[PDB]
Design a protein around this nucleic acid. Structure first.
Ligand SMILES: [Mg+2]
Lengths: 197, 304, 70, 149
DNA sequence: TATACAACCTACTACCTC
RNA sequence: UGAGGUAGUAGGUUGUAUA
């Protein structure tokens, strides 16, 4: 590769040269192509496999466009506001927030029952609360950075709470459908039966 | 597993290369499975077995099969792996490293920084300031001894994240003109890119960038040259994050792939994970079975 | 089946014959089976509110690919 | 629709300063990077293990093929690929008698039996290392079938 | 200190070979 | 342990919030 094209000796610079400078394999493949073109004579699978190996020494990828599916199913909309209700003395201390119709958490110092909606009746029918003390936060600032963080709840916790609500809501929803349950190590699996479909 | 690690540990004490071969591997037709069928039949892959065994034997006798060429000159790649030592004293966590760098003749130096630095907590897969200082100082001194100069950059990668105490200790040790970059390589986050039309999976080398500091890399899948797949059942990508550092997300991915192309223990196209971490895990598995070696050898022949 | 081993030894047996297509179509069909609306699935997070998940997963595309073998 | 970037596959060097991506093909065409002159082997195991090892070592001196020679490149042979002499004739042997394995393997605790087998094998290896004149570059441990279980 | 979660970590057995 | 990969199972730790 240190021999300039302006320095090649006469009677060679006008011929058709094969480039072994970059890689010897490409040069050898070009040599074999030239030999096979101009009917060069040649004579137990040690050479057929060898020839295939030389040919496939570089099966480079092509500039072809492809489209790939994923398993990340997106969420197109959220409820407008995330609510925080008092329900003090109307919710027993020895009563878990699970086994309840709607996804609710009892997180933070007070203002428990983190659910998106009201109507936990027939399960704790105190039905006597003052809605003025309830705290309401916009889900837009919770998910999308913003100034949703305060001394009440910082932004990081405010999102790990929403992920918990979604993971619970999926579990409660996937029970009015027509599937049964399987218990894995750390999660639940949903499968369809034989009679259905 | 008790036999192999103990044998390697004592021969490590005596520094003797060794290789364990089962009788079923070398002669698989003799050991049938009570039904006239070999338990492990190598009929269709009899040449791959020979490739692997010959390459391993050649490497263990002091010979280089190949070397890496496209790697940034002036950087050090360190891989930290934690193994749980819980036998008598406490559920301690030992840290074993592996170092790779290339300069002064285009040669490749692939060793392992050893002398496991412990941490006496049940969890806490991190290093206290003194142990981190010792680790970085030893790696830097080894590089300076080999290259007669200090590294321009250091590329620390691990399967766990780094905390501010460890990074402050590292920056305290590091010289005036040396930069440090931390990378965390998780392996099993749930992303699976299916191909819409064909019955063959996504190609190897495709990378998806989710942010200026995080990206996915497909180190497995369908490779054009071999016309086959490096895995099965819709290969899984790996997750790369630039934790505690300042660098570009493309150079990191290129370096990760280059590191994946260094598996001497087997003769394959490439492996999913970088080899600097796999060899560190092997070193840890070998060491934790022994009893308090003072200064273990750093060469890879004795371990693998 | 009330055993944790014969299910592993059957999962590993059955998964060997399934490739890109047989996983993709099955996952998409299972997701579409649950959906109530033609384009979303309803999660009742309350008596008046709900969370919708799109029926069609995220799609990626690239400019470099390979010629599929026969 | 998100865009996926592509990273070109790295290249590993071989003999003569040449480049490739598949180590098997690169070794087959060009060869290794350095010159060790031969591998003087040493076997530890029963006599049947020695016979198995010698048979395999003689087998790998000549070409071996697979079913798909594109998915898995063939093996030319040891000396053709590496340029090294690794032969069955120059083998140093240290024998583990059947009585020793029968005595040590049976009974005892799961830890004790493993410690006993490791002690036996490594005592043989170390004693051969320090109390012998013949050089052994790499030692091969041909583990019998019963020791594994 | 112990029990309800989301986010991260390691360590084993059992089954495949394209 | 000639190797590589896929999946299952078991536990643990930190940051909240409670009893
Ligand atoms: Mg090995």
């Amino acid at each position: 590769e240190n021999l300039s094209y302006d320095d090649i000796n006469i009677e060679i610079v006008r011929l058709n040269a094969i480039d072994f400078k970059k890689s010897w394999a490409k040069g050898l493949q070009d040599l074999l192509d030239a030999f096979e073109k101009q009917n060069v004579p040649k004579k137990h699978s040690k050479s057929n496999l060898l020839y295939q190996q030389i040919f496939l020494h570089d099966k480079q990828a092509i500039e072809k466009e492809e489209t790939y599916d994923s398993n990340w199913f997106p969420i197109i909309s959220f409820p407008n506001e995330l609510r925080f209700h008092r329900y003090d003395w109307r919710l027993p201390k020895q009563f878990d927030v699970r086994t309840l119709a709607f996804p609710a958490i009892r997180y933070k110092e007070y203002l428990c029952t983190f659910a998106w909606e009201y109507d936990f009746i027939h399960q704790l029918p105190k039905t006597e609360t003052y809605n003025g003390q309830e705290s309401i936060r916009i889900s837009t600032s919770d998910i999308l950075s913003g100034r949703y963080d305060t001394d009440f709840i910082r932004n990081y916790e405010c999102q790990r709470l929403i992920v918990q609500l979604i993971n619970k809501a999926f579990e409660l929803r996937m029970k009015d459908k027509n599937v049964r349950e399987y218990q894995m190590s750390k999660t639940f699996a949903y499968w369809i039966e034989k009679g259905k479909l | 597993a008790q036999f192999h690690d103990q044998l390697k540990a004592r021969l490590l004490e005596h520094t003797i290369p060794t290789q364990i071969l089962r009788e079923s591997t070398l002669a698989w037709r003799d050991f049938k499975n009570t039904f006239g069928a070999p338990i492990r039949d190598f009929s269709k892959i009899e040449g791959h077995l020979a490739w692997t065994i010959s390459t391993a034997a050649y490497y263990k006798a002091g010979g280089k099969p190949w070397k890496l060429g496209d790697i940034r000159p002036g950087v050090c790649y360190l891989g930290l792996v934690y193994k749980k030592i819980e036998k008598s004293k406490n559920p301690q966590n030992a840290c074993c490293a592996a170092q790779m760098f290339l300069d002064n003749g285009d040669g490749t130096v692939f060793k392992g920084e050893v002398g496991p630095w412990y941490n006496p907590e049940k969890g806490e897969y991190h290093l206290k300031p003194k142990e981190a200082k010792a680790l970085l100082t030893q790696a830097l001194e080894s590089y300076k001894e080999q290259n007669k100069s200090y590294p321009k950059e250091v590329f620390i990668h691990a399967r766990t994240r780094f905390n501010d105490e460890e990074w402050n200790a590292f920056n305290e040790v590091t010289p005036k003109n040396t930069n440090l970059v931390g990378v965390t390589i998780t392996k099993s986050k749930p992303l699976k890119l299916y191909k819409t039309e064909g019955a063959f999976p996504i190609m190897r080398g495709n990378a998806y960038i989710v942010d200026e500091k995080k990206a996915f890399l497909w180190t497995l899948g369908f490779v054009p040259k071999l016309q086959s797949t490096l895995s099965m059942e819709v290969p899984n990508p790996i997750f790369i994050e630039i934790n505690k550092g300042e660098a570009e997300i493309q150079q990191v991915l290129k370096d990760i792939l280059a590191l994946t192309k260094l598996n001497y223990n087997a003769c394959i196209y490439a492996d999913g994970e970088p080899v600097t971490l796999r060899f560190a895990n092997k070193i840890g598995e070998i060491l934790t079975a022994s009893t308090e070696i003072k200064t273990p050898p750093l060469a890879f022949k004795y371990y693998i | 089946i009330k055993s944790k081993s014969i299910q592993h030894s059957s999962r590993r047996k059955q998964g060997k014959n399934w490739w890109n297509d047989k996983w993709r179509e099955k996952l998409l069909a299972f997701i579409r089976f649950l959906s109530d609306d033609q384009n979303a699935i309803y999660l009742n997070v309350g008596s008046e509110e709900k969370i919708l998940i799109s029926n069609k997963p995220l799609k990626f595309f690239g400019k470099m690919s390979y010629v599929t073998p026969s | 629709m998100k865009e996926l970037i592509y990273i070109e596959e790295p290249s590993i060097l071989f003999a003569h300063g040449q480049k490739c991506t598949d180590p098997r093909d690169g070794l087959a065409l060009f060869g290794p990077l350095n010159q060790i002159y031969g591998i003087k082997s040493g076997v530890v195991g029963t006599q049947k293990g020695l016979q198995i090892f010698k048979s395999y070592l003689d087998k790998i001196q000549k070409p071996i093929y697979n079913h798909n020679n594109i998915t898995r490149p063939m093996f030319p042979g040891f000396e053709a690929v590496f340029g090294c002499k690794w032969e069955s004739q120059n083998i140093v042997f240290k024998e583990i008698t059947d009585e020793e394995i029968r005595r040590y393997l049976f009974n005892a605790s799961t830890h004790k039996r493993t410690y006993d087998l490791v002690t036996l094998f490594n005592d043989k290896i170390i004693t051969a290392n320090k109390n012998d004149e013949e050089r052994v570059d790499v030692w091969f441990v041909i583990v019998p079938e019963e020791i594994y279980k």
